[PDB]
Amino acid sequence: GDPVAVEALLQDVFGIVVDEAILKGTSASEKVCEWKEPEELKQLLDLELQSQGESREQILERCRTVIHYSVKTGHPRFFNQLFSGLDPHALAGRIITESLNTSQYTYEIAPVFVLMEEEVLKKLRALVGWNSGDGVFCPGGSISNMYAMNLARFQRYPDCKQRGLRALPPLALFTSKECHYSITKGAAFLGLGTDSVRVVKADERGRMIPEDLERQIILAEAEGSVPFLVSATSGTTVLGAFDPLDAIADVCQRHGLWFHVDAAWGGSVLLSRTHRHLLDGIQRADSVAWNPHKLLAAGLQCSALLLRDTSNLLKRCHGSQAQQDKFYDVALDTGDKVVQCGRRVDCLKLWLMWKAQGGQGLERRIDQAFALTRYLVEEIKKREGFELVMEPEFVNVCFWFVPPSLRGKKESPDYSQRLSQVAPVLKERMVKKGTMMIGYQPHGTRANFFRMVVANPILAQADIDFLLGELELLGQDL
Amino acid sequence: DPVAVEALLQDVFGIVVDEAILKGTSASEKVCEWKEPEELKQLLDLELQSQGESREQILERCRTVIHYSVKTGHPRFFNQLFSGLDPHALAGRIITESLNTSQYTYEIAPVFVLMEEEVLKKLRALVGWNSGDGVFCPGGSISNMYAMNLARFQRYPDCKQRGLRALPPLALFTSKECHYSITKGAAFLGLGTDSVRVVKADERGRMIPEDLERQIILAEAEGSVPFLVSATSGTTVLGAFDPLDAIADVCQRHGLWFHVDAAWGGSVLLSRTHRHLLDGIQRADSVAWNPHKLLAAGLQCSALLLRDTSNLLKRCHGSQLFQQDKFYDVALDTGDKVVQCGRRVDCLKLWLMWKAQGGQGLERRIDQAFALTRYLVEEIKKREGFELVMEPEFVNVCFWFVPPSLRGKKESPDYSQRLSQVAPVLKERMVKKGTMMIGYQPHRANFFRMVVANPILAQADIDFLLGELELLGQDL
Ligand SMILES: [Cl-]
Ligand SMILES: [Cl-]
Ligand SMILES: [Cl-]
Ligand SMILES: [Cl-]
Ligand SMILES: [Cl-]
Ligand SMILES: [Cl-]
Ligand SMILES: [Co+2]
Ligand SMILES: [Co+2]
Numbered sequence: 001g002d003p004v005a006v007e008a009l010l011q012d013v014f015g016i017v018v019d020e021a022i023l024k025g026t027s028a029s030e031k032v033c034e035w036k037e038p039e040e041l042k043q044l045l046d047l048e049l050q051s052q053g054e055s056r057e058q059i060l061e062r063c064r065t066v067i068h069y070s071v072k073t074g075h076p077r078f079f080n081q082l083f084s085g086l087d088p089h090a091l092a093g094r095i096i097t098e099s100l101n102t103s104q105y106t107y108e109i110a111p112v113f114v115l116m117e118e119e120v121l122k123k124l125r126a127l128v129g130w131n132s133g134d135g136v137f138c139p140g141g142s143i144s145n146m147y148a149m150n151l152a153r154f155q156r157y158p159d160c161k162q163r164g165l166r167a168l169p170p171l172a173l174f175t176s177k178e179c180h181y182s183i184t185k186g187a188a189f190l191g192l193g194t195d196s197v198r199v200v201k202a203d204e205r206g207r208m209i210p211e212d213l214e215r216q217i218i219l220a221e222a223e224g225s226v227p228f229l230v231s232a233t234s235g236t237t238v239l240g241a242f243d244p245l246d247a248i249a250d251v252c253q254r255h256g257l258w259f260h261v262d263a264a265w266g267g268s269v270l271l272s273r274t275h276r277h278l279l280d281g282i283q284r285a286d287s288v289a290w291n292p293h294k295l296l297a298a299g300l301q302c303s304a305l306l307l308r309d310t311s312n313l314l315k316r317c318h319g320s321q322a323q324q325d326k327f328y329d330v331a332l333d334t335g336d337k338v339v340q341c342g343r344r345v346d347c348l349k350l351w352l353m354w355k356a357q358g359g360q361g362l363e364r365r366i367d368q369a370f371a372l373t374r375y376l377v378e379e380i381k382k383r384e385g386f387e388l389v390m391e392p393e394f395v396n397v398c399f400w401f402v403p404p405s406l407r408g409k410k411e412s413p414d415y416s417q418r419l420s421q422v423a424p425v426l427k428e429r430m431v432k433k434g435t436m437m438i439g440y441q442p443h444g445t446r447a448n449f450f451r452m453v454v455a456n457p458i459l460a461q462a463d464i465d466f467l468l469g470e471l472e473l474l475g476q477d478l
Numbered sequence: 479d480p481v482a483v484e485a486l487l488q489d490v491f492g493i494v495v496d497e498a499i500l501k502g503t504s505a506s507e508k509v510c511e512w513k514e515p516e517e518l519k520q521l522l523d524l525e526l527q528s529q530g531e532s533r534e535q536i537l538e539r540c541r542t543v544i545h546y547s548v549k550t551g552h553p554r555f556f557n558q559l560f561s562g563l564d565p566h567a568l569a570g571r572i573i574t575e576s577l578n579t580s581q582y583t584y585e586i587a588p589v590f591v592l593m594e595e596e597v598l599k600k601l602r603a604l605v606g607w608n609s610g611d612g613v614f615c616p617g618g619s620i621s622n623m624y625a626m627n628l629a630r631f632q633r634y635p636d637c638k639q640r641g642l643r644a645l646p647p648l649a650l651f652t653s654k655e656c657h658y659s660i661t662k663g664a665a666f667l668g669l670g671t672d673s674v675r676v677v678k679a680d681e682r683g684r685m686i687p688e689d690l691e692r693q694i695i696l697a698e699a700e701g702s703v704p705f706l707v708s709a710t711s712g713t714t715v716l717g718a719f720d721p722l723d724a725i726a727d728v729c730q731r732h733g734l735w736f737h738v739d740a741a742w743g744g745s746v747l748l749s750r751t752h753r754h755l756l757d758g759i760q761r762a763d764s765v766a767w768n769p770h771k772l773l774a775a776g777l778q779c780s781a782l783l784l785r786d787t788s789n790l791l792k793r794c795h796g797s798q799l800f801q802q803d804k805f806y807d808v809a810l811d812t813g814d815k816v817v818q819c820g821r822r823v824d825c826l827k828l829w830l831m832w833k834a835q836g837g838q839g840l841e842r843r844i845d846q847a848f849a850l851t852r853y854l855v856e857e858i859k860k861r862e863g864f865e866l867v868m869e870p871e872f873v874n875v876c877f878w879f880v881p882p883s884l885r886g887k888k889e890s891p892d893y894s895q896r897l898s899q900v901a902p903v904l905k906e907r908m909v910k911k912g913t914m915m916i917g918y919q920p921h922r923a924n925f926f927r928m929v930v931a932n933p934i935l936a937q938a939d940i941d942f943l944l945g946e947l948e949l950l951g952q953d954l
Pocket of ligand 8: 858859860861862863864865
C-alpha cells in the first residue's frame with residue numbers, strides 16, 4: 001500500500017529492465033560493456049546516500065544509469081567468466097524468488113521450495129549415479145567444498161565438533177595443482193591451515209596423476225599427518241581438465257579416504273549422454289560439488305553439495321544441540337543440514353528452466369557448446385597468429401594471439417616475455433571499445449594466454465568469427 | 479526471438495504482480511496456504527523429465543508456486559525477524575537478477591563495486607566510524623564466522639598456514655541469549671563448541687559484565703587464551719540489547735576483540751530517537767548488521783563492518799610467474815576479502831530503497847515500528863488472557879495467551895505444564911486457517927514472540943491478531 005502506486009512503479013521498472021537489460025543486453029548490435037574509469041563512474045552514478053528521498057522519475061533514471069554502465073553478462077560476446085548468457089526461464093524463476101522473499105530453513109515458511117529442493121537434489125544424485133543419498137544447496141561452490149572437508153573431518157573424528165582440532169592429530173588432504181583456490185581458503189577457514197593441503201602433480205593435459213597422489217599420501221603419513229580426504233576436479237577453471245576419477249577412487253579405497261569431486265564447473269556435463277564419460281567414476285565419490293549457475297546459466301548462486309551418505313551425517317555434523325512439539329514431520333526442516341540459518345531459495349530458477357527445456361533441451365545446449373568449441377578450435381588452427389596452448393577437453397579453449405612482430409621469433413631469448421604482454425593489451429582495447437570480453441591469465445611457465453569459454457546458449461559461429469577477427473584487428477600493431 | 483522473450487517475461491511478471499505482490503500484501507488473503515507435505519508433493523508435480531513444457535504449462539507452474547508459498551509481505555506475517563515488501567528494494571532485486579553478475583571485480587561489476595563501497599561507507603558512518611572496511615556475506619551466520627575467523631587471524635596469523643594445533647587453546651565469550659551461529663561457527667572453524675564460554679544474562683536478557691569478566695579470568699586460569707567477546711544488540715527471541723559500553727570496558731581491560739552481533743538490532747542505528755540502545759558500538763572491532771531484517775531489503779542483505787583500515791580482511795581471506803598486468807587498479811577488486819569466489823550483488827536493493835526513502839524515510843519506518851510495539855504492549859496489558867513475559871526494549875513482544883480454562887489457576891502445581899501446551903496448538907490452528915503466523919519459543923513455558931516490523935503495519939492488524947488469538951483459544 002499504495003498498491004496502485006506499487007504496481008505502477010514495478011511495471012515501469014520492469015519495462016526498463018526488459019528493454020535495456022534483456023533485449024539490448026543480449027544483442028550483438030550493442031556493447032558488452034561501457035568502460036569508465038572508477039572516479040568518472042562515481043561522478044556519473046551520484047551514489048552518496050542522504051536524508052531526503054527522491055522522486056519516482058529520479059529513481060527510474062537511476063535504474064537506467066545502473067543498467068547502462070553495467071557489464072552485459074548475457075551478451076553473445078561476453079566470454080570473461082565460466083558463466084555467460086541469460087536463460088529467460090531461469091530469470092523468471094529468479095524474479096519469482098525475489099518477490100516471495102523467504103528463507104529456505106523450515107517447511108513452515110518455505111513449503112514449496114523445501115520439497116522442490118529435495119526433488120532437484122534427488123535428480124542431481126541420479127545423474128551422478130545414486131538412487132539414494134543426501135545433500136543441500138550452498139551460497140557458492142566454494143562453500144560446498146568446505147562442507148565436504150568439514151564432513152570428512154567429522155566422519156573420521158566426530159570429537160572435533162565439540163573439542164576442536166587440538167584433540168586431533170595433524171590432518172592432510174590432497175588436491176591437484178590445477179585445483180580451485182577454494183580448497184586452500186577453506187582449509188584455512190576450517191582451522192586446518194593451508195599447509196594441510198598436499199598438492200599433487202598434474203599431467204600435460206592438466207589431470208591429477210594417480211601415482212603422485214599415492215606417493216603424496218604415503219609421504220604425508222611418514223611425516224606424522226593423517227590423510228583424510230582427496231579432492232579431485234572435474235572441470236578445472238583454467239584448462240577445463242577432468243581428473244581421472246576411477247583411478248583416484250582406487251587410491252581412496254585402498255587408503256580409506258573420503259573421496260570428494262569438485263565438479264562445480266564440469267558436473268553439468270552429466271546431462272549429456274554424449275559427453276558425460278568425462279566424469280566416469282564419479283559414482284564412487286562420497287561427495288560432489290556441482291554449480292548449475294555456470295554451464296547451465298541458472299544464475300548466481302546455484303551450487304549443490306551431493307552426498308552418498310544415507311545416515312543423516314549432514315544433520316549430525318552441522319545440527320545444533322537443541323522441534324519436539326510441531327504438527328509436521330520435522331525431517332523436512334533443513335536448518336540442521338547447514339551452518340547458515342537464513343538461506344536463499346536457489347532451486348526455483350533451475351527447476352523452472354529444467355521444466356521448460358526438459359532434460360533434452362539442456363542436453364542439447366551442452367552438446368551445442370561442445371560443438372561450437374570444435375568450431376573455435378578449427379578456426380584457431382586455420383588462422384595465422386593463433387596458437388593453441390593445448391587440446392581442449394571441455395569448453396575452455398586456451399590460446400595465444402601471436403602478433404606479426406613475433407611470428408617466427410620463438411627461438412628469440414625474450415619471446416615468452418614479449419608474448420606475455422600481448423593479452424593484457426588486447427584486453428584493455430576490447431574492454432575500452434566494448435566489443436567483447438575474454439579472460440586471460442598466465443599458467444606455470446606459460447606466457448599470458450586467453451581462456452575462451454563456449455557456454456552462452458545463444459552463441460553462434462558468427463560470434464566466434466567475430467572474436468577471432470577482432471583479435472586480429474586489435475593486435476595488428478603488437 | 480526477442481518478441482517471444484519479452485512476451486514470456488511480461489506474462490510471468492503479470493502473474494508475479496497479481497499473485498505475489500498484490501494478493502501477498504492484501505489483508506483479505508491468507509498468509510499461508512497450508513498443505514500436508516505429501517499432498518503438496520503430489521500437487522506440485524516436481525519430477526524433472528526429458529521432454530520440456532509449453533509456455534502455458536510454465537505460466538501455470540508460476541502461479542501454483544506463488545499460491546502455495548508463504549506471503550512474507552502480508553500484514554499478518556509475524557513468524558520471523560523480517561516481514562513486508564518494499565517495492566524499491568524489490569525493484570533493485572529484479573534488476574540485480576537480470577544483470578546476473580558476480581560481486582568480484584570492477585572488470586565485471588563496475589557499478590556494484592563502487593555501490594557496495596558507498597553503502598558500506600554509510601553503514602560504518604551510522605556505526606560511528608568515518609573509516610574502515612567490510613563486505614557483504616550470505617547471511618548473518620556467516621558474518622559472525624568471518625568475525626570469529628578475523629579475530630583468530632588478527633591475534634594468531636600463523637593459523638592461516640599452520641592451523642589450530644600450532645596455537646594455544648582459545649576461548650570466546652557470548653551471552654546465553656546469543657544466536658546459535660556462534661556455536662555452529664566455532665565447530666566449523668575447528669575451534670570446537672567447547673571453546674565458546676556462555677556468559678550469564680540478566681532478567682532482561684542482557685549479558686552481565688560481571689560474569690563475562692569472571693569467565694575470562696577462569697579461561698585464563700584453565701590455560702586457554704581469551705581472544706574474542708561476541709555481544710548481541712537485539713537478540714532473536716527477546717530483542718534484548720547487551721550493554722555495549724560496559725562490555726567494551728571489559729574487552730579493553732583484557733585486550734580482546736570486541737564483536738557486536740547487530741544482525742537484528744543494527745538497523746535501529748538509523749533512528750536518532752532509539753539508537754541509544756547501541757551506545758558503545760563505535761568501540762567495537764566488528765559489527766554484523768542485517769538490513770534484510772528490519773529494513774526489509776530482501777534476503778540476503780547482511781553486512782560485516784570493521785573499524786580496521788589496514789586490509790586485515792584481505793590478508794585473512796586472500797588467496798596467496800608471468801605477471802597478470804591488469805590495466806586498472808585491482809585494489810578495487812574484493813575477491814580477497816571473502817572466502818567465497820563468486821558472490822551475489824546484494825547492495826543494489828538496499829541502495830535503491832535508501833535513495834527512494836532517504837535516511838529520513840527509513841528512520842520514519844523504524845520509529846513507527848517502535849510506536850506500534852508500544853500499542854501492542856498496551857493492548858496486551860489491557861486485555862484479559864494476555865500476559866507479557868517481560869518488558870520489550872525492541873520490537874520483539876514476548877507474551878502468553880492464558881486460555882479461559884487456566885485463568886485464575888496460577889497456583890496449581892501443573893499450571894505451567896498446561897500453559898506450555900497452548901501456544902503450539904494456537905500455532906497449528908493459525909497456520910492451518912491461514913490468518914496469521916506468530917512464532918513461539920521455549921526458553922519457561924512456550925510463549926509467543928510477536929515481531930512488529932512490516933512497514934505497512936497498522937493498529938488494525940494488532941487489534942486483529944489479539945482478537946484472533948482469543949477466537950482460536952476460547953476452547954482451551
Ligand atoms: Cl566464473
Ligand atoms: Cl544464501
Ligand atoms: Cl531429465
Ligand atoms: Cl529470521
Ligand atoms: Cl552470495
Ligand atoms: Cl542518511
Ligand atoms: Co593457427
Ligand atoms: Co492482560
